[model samples]
Structures are given as C-alpha cells and as structure tokens.
Target: DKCKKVYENYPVSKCQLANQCNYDCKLDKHARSGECFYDEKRNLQCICDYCEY
Candidate 1:
C-alpha cells in the first residue's frame, strides 16, 4: 500500500530566478548582465543557476 511518506509533499517545481536577472534562452548576450542561461519554455526557467565567476 505504499504509505510511509511517499515523498511527503512532492509537488516541487521551484526554479525561481527573477530577482531581476532577466530571462533569455538565446544562451548568452548579457543584456541584463551578471548571469544568464535559462530556458524553461519562453523566458523564466532555472531548474538551477550556479555561480563561480
């Protein structure tokens, strides 16, 4: 019966990166500057955003 916390609230869809980073899937042109590589289907999707520069 699979009932021991089957993910316990598994509706995770958190790809938030709109702290004013400006979205663009063109890969990179730096229009908003500071970081860009998002494509969640037409501007706004992060799945993840790493920084090391």
Candidate 2:
C-alpha cells in the first residue's frame, strides 16, 4: 500500500544525504548512515570504533 497512487503521476524526490552501509556501499545518498558497521565472525558484530569514519 502506498501513501499516494503509484500509477498516478507525482513529483518524485530522493534523499540528499551521504551514507555508507557498513562502508561497503558509500555513495552520495545511503539513507540513515552510521559509523557502526557489520562484522563477520559468527553473527554480525561491531568490532571497531567506526566513529568519525
């Protein structure tokens, strides 16, 4: 379910923030990016202090 009609024409917009998903996919707009990254051991874990990254 969409907030507005998907078939109908509307002014489209996108996020204008820079984000990096675990620093794996850093781009101009990644949406709600954070320094905390997903680690690989058994499950996902934060191993480094990715602050200011």
Candidate 3:
C-alpha cells in the first residue's frame, strides 16, 4: 500500500523566512517537510507534512 500523507498546522507569530520557518517546524514537530503560508485569517502559519502508515 502507498503511504498516506498528512498535514499539521502550527500558528507562528513571526515567520519572515520560509527556510527558517520550515526548519523550525521540522525541528519542533519532527515532520517530514514544512512550509510557511498564510491561513484563512491572514496569519502566518507553518504547515508540516508527514507520511502516515
């Protein structure tokens, strides 16, 4: 079976750089990959992606 993908969102008050944001998310959440983007509320958030069994 193929691995399933999952995502987790973490609110960040200040995330200017994508690399730093992604790195922090990965280090803090232990996720496979992380991305910084604006949410529905227009606030910056770190989205962590991971593989689920």
Candidate 4:
C-alpha cells in the first residue's frame, strides 16, 4: 500500500518521450493514470484507469 501510494503520487510529470515504445500513463499537474496500448491505427493509446485514476 505504501509504495502504491507513492506511485500514485509519483508525479509522472514529463510527457511521453518519442523513443519509448511501451509506456504507462503519462501525467501532468492534473491528469489521471491510464493503461497503455496500441490500436490498429498504430497510435499510442491510453485508457484512463478509474481506480488508479
């Protein structure tokens, strides 16, 4: 729970770097955590997690 809390508040401040292929949610000052994936269009997609979000 402790590390989870820390992760939750970890402030993933940077935008997703172009070189990264696999990624987790990218966050800013006011954003939620999300699941990462790729679709048929091949765009990096993110679905916000309601729980972690």
Best by lDDT: 3
TM of each candidate vs. truth: 0.19, 0.16, 0.55, 0.30
Taking all chains together, the TM-score of candidate 3 against the true structure is 0.55
Instruction: Write candidate 3's Cα lDDT for 1-53 as tens digits.
Output: 12222233445653666675657667866555456656667766666556642
lDDT string, candidate 4, 6-45, tens digits: 1222222322543221133434222244443344645444
Candidate 1 C-alpha lDDT tens digits along 1-53: 11111110111232244433323311322232223233433433322223333
- Cα RMSD for predicted model 3: 5.2
lDDT of 2 by residue, 9-38 (tens): 111112112222323222312322322322
lDDT of each: 0.27, 0.23, 0.56, 0.34
Please say which candidate is ahead in TM-score: 1 or 2.
Answer: 1
- Show model 2 residue runs off by greater than 4 Å: 1-42, 48-50
| Residue 10 local lDDT, model 2 | 12
Q: How many residue pairs clash in model 3?
A: 0
**Backbone collision count in every prediction?**
0, 0, 0, 0
